[PDB]
Design a protein around this ligand. Structure first.
Ligand SMILES: *[C@@H]1O[C@H](CO)[C@@H](O)[C@H](O)[C@H]1NC(C)=O
Ligand SMILES: *[C@@H]1O[C@H](CO)[C@@H](O)[C@H](O)[C@H]1NC(C)=O
Lengths: 364, 374
């Protein structure tokens, strides 16, 4: 139990109403990590990172990660540790607007592992802009050329957390049998202004300029989706090299939230590795895809009455549920690989319980 | 191996335009269409000596892997004719650890039934259902045929994991091991088409139907609303369900109420399973929210090509044109349909017919056998 990580978690994980209510300040700073990481051997030991593969099955199925962050070093460290394995690869994209101490702290952690690094290209990410997509593309470039054996790439943000162990992830990926898995649905006509008009970053905010854009440079229709995906290395190589895709991406640079349509659209282009035909019969909702479990305030409700999922037990930020300990029990029963979003400032117990649970389960 | 099975199937499976064209011209040959075919009486005799039947037909009577042994599958096969296709189908999916219930329509020729009973007598885990229905197209009796097999299979063994129902025109496109793996990947959930009920399919349960002149017809009588809190969903007669789902369907009172209500609807097989799959508390079900809907293409139960959807895949069509022939808008596969088909994730495909293209079945059959023996 030396690798295991005053509330009873088991009761929380079982959805015990008693503890849920019962549950519903010291903290390391970037400088603590900068110092703490000087001695990698001790950092790794004290933080309890797993530096040896757990099974031969996992050794044979390497996974790559693109992690886009900009703050909260303790959360990054906790997320990294939860998903870290020696055989995998981890690219960390630190926003150019991040505090220098944060960047130094991230490099501090990354510098302790030969498979963790900071992307060779970094963007100043603006909410809803192409730069958010570019951040992942920067990591895709690095990850693709550095190793030819990883099977899938999963992109993450700082407030994500896994709800599956590395082994469980590997198994679900094998279950996809070479196909990609991400939300991709017929584009609602009502969102057309997101790409029919040109957007410009005005005073820090991406805004509609009213300038008319040309039609998308592709035969295939645009599809609606998420910024999060689970794609094969082959999909990545195609995105990075295919000329038509490059044309599509350059056209998308001045659209609104291109991250919410680019991946979903490419996933339906013929000849793209791991893609699905454009016929709507193949559409995948956020719940049917396994990329990310996210609760939207306007959809929460009585599951036995038509609701996709139960109400949030934490708090809502921009209509998105920031999980509370009470959300954990139902959440763990879903098939998604990761869930969003978590925040130590909202409910640190939702994190701790999940983290401890996955570590114990993995050590089995 | 004694178990392996002038056309080069390897090229067909690769979509070789040349090899495909060759099989199509072969089919047209008078010599081919005038080839000797087996009769139900041939099978009645051949099955007299089971040891000989098994060896001659090359049935696998020993598990291939420990993985498969630890994951038994049950099958409900609804048939009424074409004994050779039933033979090819059964052989292609047969494994000693699995269970197979065959429902022969009560209106099937007496010789067909005898033949089926003959084939079944050769395998302890293969049997004819204890209750046989006279199935009328689109009627509740089609559903009853499967319910009859569910009862027999559920009581016969408590260790099988999933039940997969089939008809005589189906054929697998996955080996038993591949099937076992996709079922394990389902993590105790069922898998079948289930989507929001289309407005153009409501007249089927809003009115009572009765068989008139051999066909189910609207009586004009309006029936009460379904005995359910959740909505009715649209789907297919074919499913992939856990043993737990089967036990719940056979036992639960409310489900019982739903079924009795559906008895006089049109094509209840196309909404019953899809609907039960969305009822809270049903083992392996999905929430009723439409975010969980599964189309025929996203579900893994059955790959079927509908004439009105076929087209340029690279332009919006869910699949390429039928290389075989269409019957009631459904594509009866030709050898040319195999290449693309094998790349799909479904467990089985429909429809196949050795009177349309025997090579479609043969190439698929050899490929799966070879793949399994590897
Ligand atoms: C069928 O053709 C393939 C190459 O297209 C070849 O590998 C295979 O051996 C051929 N089969 C026979 C029996 O000639
Ligand atoms: C075997 O089947 C043939 C028809 O194929 C039938 O005429 C014959 O009687 C059977 N053999 C016997 C005599 O048992």
């Amino acid at each position: 139990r030396h690798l295991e990580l005053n509330v009873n978690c088991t009761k929380i994980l079982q959805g015990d109403p008693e503890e849920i209510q019962k549950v519903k300040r010291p903290r390391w700073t970037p400088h603590d990590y900068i110092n703490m990481t000087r001695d990698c051997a001790s950092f790794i030991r004290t933080r309890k990172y797993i530096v040896e593969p757990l099974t031969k099955e996992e050794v044979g199925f390497p996974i790559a990660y693109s992690i886009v962050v900009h703050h909260k070093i303790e959360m990054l460290d906790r997320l990294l540790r939860a998903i870290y394995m020696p055989q995998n690869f981890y690219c960390i994209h630190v926003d150019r607007k991040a505090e220098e101490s944060f960047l130094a702290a991230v490099q501090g952690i990354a510098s302790c592992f030969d498979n963790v690094f900071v992307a060779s290209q970094l963007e100043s990410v603006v909410y809803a802009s192409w730069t958010r997509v570019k951040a992942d593309l920067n990591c895709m470039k690095d990850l693709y050329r550095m190793n030819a054996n990883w099977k899938y790439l999963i992109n993450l943000c700082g407030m994500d957390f896994p709800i599956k162990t590395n082994l469980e992830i590997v198994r679900k990926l094998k279950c996809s049998t070479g196909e990609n898995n991400l939300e991709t649905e017929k584009m609602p006509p009502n969102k057309e202004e997101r790409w029919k008009k040109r957007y410009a970053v005005v005073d820090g905010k991406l805004t509609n300029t009213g300038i008319v854009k040309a039609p998308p440079p592709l035969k295939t229709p645009l599809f609606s989706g998420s910024a999060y995906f689970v794609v094969t290395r082959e999909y990545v190589g195609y995105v990075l090299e295919n000329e038509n895709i490059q044309k599509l991406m350059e056209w998308a640079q001045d659209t609104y939230s291109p991250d919410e349509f680019l991946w979903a659209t490419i996933q339906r282009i013929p000849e793209v590795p791991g893609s699905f035909p454009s016929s709507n019969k193949y559409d995948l909702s956020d719940m049917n895809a396994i990329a990310r479990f996210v609760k939207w305030q306007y959809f929460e409700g009585d599951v036995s009455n038509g609701a996709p999922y139960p109400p949030c037990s934490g708090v809502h930020v921009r209509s998105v549920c920031v999980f509370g300990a009470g959300d954990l029990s139902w959440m763990l029963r879903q098939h998604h690989l990761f869930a969003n979003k978590f925040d130590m400032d909202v409910d640190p117990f939702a994190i701790q319980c999940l983290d401890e649970h996955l570590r114990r389960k993995a050590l089995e």
